[PDB]
């Protein structure tokens, strides 16, 4: 054998109405976890179901909206369930022997799950991931001891250089290596059929009207839907597919004028073998802008520290569940954590750079003082001192001159930092410094320079990283107009709105 | 007025032996949580107790070593317990009213917990955090809607510029604002006494011989130790304090040169009111190098995606628990998650820059091929094509000349990217491009240039971010000597390993 296509038609003869006895598959029943877990892999599953309290109401939902929070799994994603299940079944099968090598083509989360289990169980782990996936995924994979290979983001799945193609190529060169293959492996949807779906039914007391889930491999939606069609046939199954992907039906939904997208984990250029599209009642297409808008809303309004595809899911859910009435219930799957996207959608700079926040239209929720300039604060000219000054002479000069702080500026005009009366006194009284010592241990070295013409909004951002902003002269660096801290900005804002 | 010292002596009349009936505090009994959580704040507590299987044995421990994993709480840390309890108690005692302002001096984790609860409950949240704390904490705080103020890392606690001093100064300027004050609030150690400690006892069947906990506010170790001294008196309480802090006893342990350190959340320049050192049996001084070495070891060997102070705790535990025999049990508290330190200890560049990792220890464990040069791969000079070539002509020339890929190089010598036979054919068969089209839609624009003199170790790092490495000449107009992928390095290593 050279390669097995990830989109080959499924040979599963499952049909709704067919009893469980007829299944050729091994089904693992959820097991009572002991008081002390023997390893972290037992902390995969039994994820919380949390009511959404603000977002549903905001978008006019009448029904109850609940979120299945899969980011609480050991590795931080829903994929920890399939990572563990694929390994356990392969071990039981005799396929995976001790110390063997696991190679897996992944968008990140299956790779993390497999790398975590490989770290614990003692397997060599090689992950093949497209170039677009976050550096935070790489960082965690490296820490877990996984070897990482990258493939071009725009490589077609059936090309030699796709993540799938490269994984098979590496397996062919490494003896004792296996590709568990999440795109074809029944252990993927069966993990969701046996556990994720059983948890949802248990948590809902078997009463559920709608399920919304984003689609990558299709294991989550397939596993959950097959079980729900058997146990709760009245539950409508809603699939979420990004614009650029071809998973959605009817095919008319996939005719778009763009092929790439920023959201990670969902959508493909092929139909994975594990995806059963017949069990999905309706599909909705999502875009990056609404996915990141909703992910940021989930964090800001619900405190759910989830990722991009979780935003895509809730963005669809508020449209899809509009038809539900009071008393009815909609469940959404939140697949992964914000950890994977710290420097991506979590960053306003990244959102702006990608055009997902219109800066001009963002200024509508910005305070009245945001666009005012630094000079309007009424800056007090500060006294400056040389770095050669003693701790004792610093106390003398600040008290003699009536200042509580002083920037330290050398003979060449370089601003070295700040010294305060309070800190110098506290350090002296605690014996940290002697009066004759130089100010080296007491000086506050970190500060940001700002112009008289900079905005107060710029100042506000600066004050989230530094304690003080030093207002300088563009033509005389040694010349400091003022020292501004968060307290000065508050005093200004408060005084202005205590008289108008 | 204006401020109450966070180190004022405790007025608590608790003493070991006093019946719980004499406590004047409110005590919450942990109760079963509902199937569906009304909000994410209910996902605080009931944290896992996980057996440490490799690290303990590696350092010669005979006892069982267990980890109480607090990073599974809603906000990612142990502090989510105290954030919720401080708010709940303040609401119940009438001090905190709907829509009031919460201001808190924090190292980050209490701020995250409070910001999460404030986002859910609808309170304005202002965090005052030292400059050393990670930018990852700032990014999560921003996403939750908290306002962020920073203070100098080297500001003495009693100076006006400390995180506690600034929080009080802000409160005095904001009407209807409150400082819950984790340094003096009984709700901090009470959260641990009522819930964390009872969980540890439930999980251990009331039988454990040693508890190791790192110390910041002291709420965790004080709450747990007061309950453990009452219900498991044989348990040894071990406190972990970083070098640079003054919390440890005897004072002789604290006679260190420096007072600054990279580990976050532990150690202080004052004794917090909530810290009861009389219930700590022994202190150990930890350092940054061992804290990060152990946090990386916990990830790599145990799959525990924890933070820096978790590493400090386990670094001490493998020393403190040496006195225990086979059959005894040591429990460590792992306070937060790796999410807060993505670009800090998780990064090898940061570790190198800080001196916690040396090129010597970085090498040794490196494979035999690591220091070989790219030139030793035995590169083949590739066929290059112009960017004006058609998709049809690309198929023809690659097949005709016997190549599977070609760099695209313009007449000025600029490398635009790569084209492949496989991707071009798949694109054509799927109707993405027409034979007469130029290759703009198929070209792989992302690649990394490498030199013939660079090492295979450098190539390996490059291959964790890019699929293609193009070997070039610094003197000629970017003339390509060869194209390398992860398959090409594996082919070189595997063939040479057969000869060896
Ligand atoms: C109880 C009813 C079911 C029957 C009678 C059935 C039957 C089969 C048969 C005959 C095969 C081909 C042999 C093989 O690959 O093992 C198969 C494959 C498979 N089954 Fe099932 N199955 C059932 C339920 C399920 C469920 C609930 C899932 C979802 C989690 C599932 C997922 C799969 C997958 C993904 C394959 C792989 C297809 C391939 O290799 O092309 N099956 N099934
Ligand atoms: C034997 C039982 C206890 C007695 C008689 C006791 C008594 C007191 C009293 C009289 C106060 C003064 C303020 C107030 O009444 O609210 C107090 C404060 C305090 N208690 Fe309790 N307490 C007991 C147990 C605990 C426990 C189990 C903890 C948690 C580990 C705790 C932590 C504190 C703290 C941190 C303070 C703040 C000290 C201050 O007000 O400056 N106490 N306690
Ligand atoms: C963030 C995220 N959301 C959503 C999903 C979609 O889940 P499913 O593939 O089960 O439909 C995934 C799964 N991506 O494909 C496997 C992988 O992580 O390597 C995902 O990672
Ligand atoms: C606060 C904190 C600690 C110390 O716990 P306390 O309850 O404050 O003693 C340890 N680790 C981290 C990361 C924390 O932020």
Author numbering:
A (entry chain B), B (entry chain A): 41 to 540
Task: Quote the authors verbatim.
Cystathionine beta-synthase (CBS) is a pivotal enzyme of the transsulfuration pathway responsible for diverting homocysteine to the biosynthesis of cysteine and production of hydrogen sulfide (H2S). In the second step, cystathionine gamma-lyase (CSE) hydrolyses Cth into cysteine (Cys), which is essential for protein synthesis, biosynthesis of glutathione and taurine, redox regulation and biogenesis of the gaseous signaling molecule hydrogen sulfide (H2S). Here, we characterized binding and inhibitory mechanism of aminooxyacetic acid (AOAA), the most commonly used CBS inhibitor.
In addition to the spectroscopic, catalytic and cellular consequences of AOAA binding to CBS, we solved the crystal structure of HsCBS in complex with AOAA to gain knowledge about its molecular interactions. Refinement and iterative model building eventually yielded structure, in which observed electron densities correspond to PLP bound to K119 in chain A and PLP-AOAA adduct in chain B. In chain A, the PLP cofactor binds a conserved K119 residue via a Schiff base bond, thus forming internal aldimine, which is stabilized in the catalytic cavity by multiple hydrogen-bonding interactions with the surrounding residues. Although the linkage between PLP and K119 is broken, the residue remains in close proximity and participates in the stabilization of the phosphate moiety. Indeed, unlike in the case of PLP-AOAA oxime type external aldimine, the PLP-Ser external aldimine of HsCBS formed a richer network of hydrogen bonds, particularly with G305 and Y308, which poised this complex toward the formation of PLP-aminoacrylate intermediate and thus continuation of the catalytic cycle.
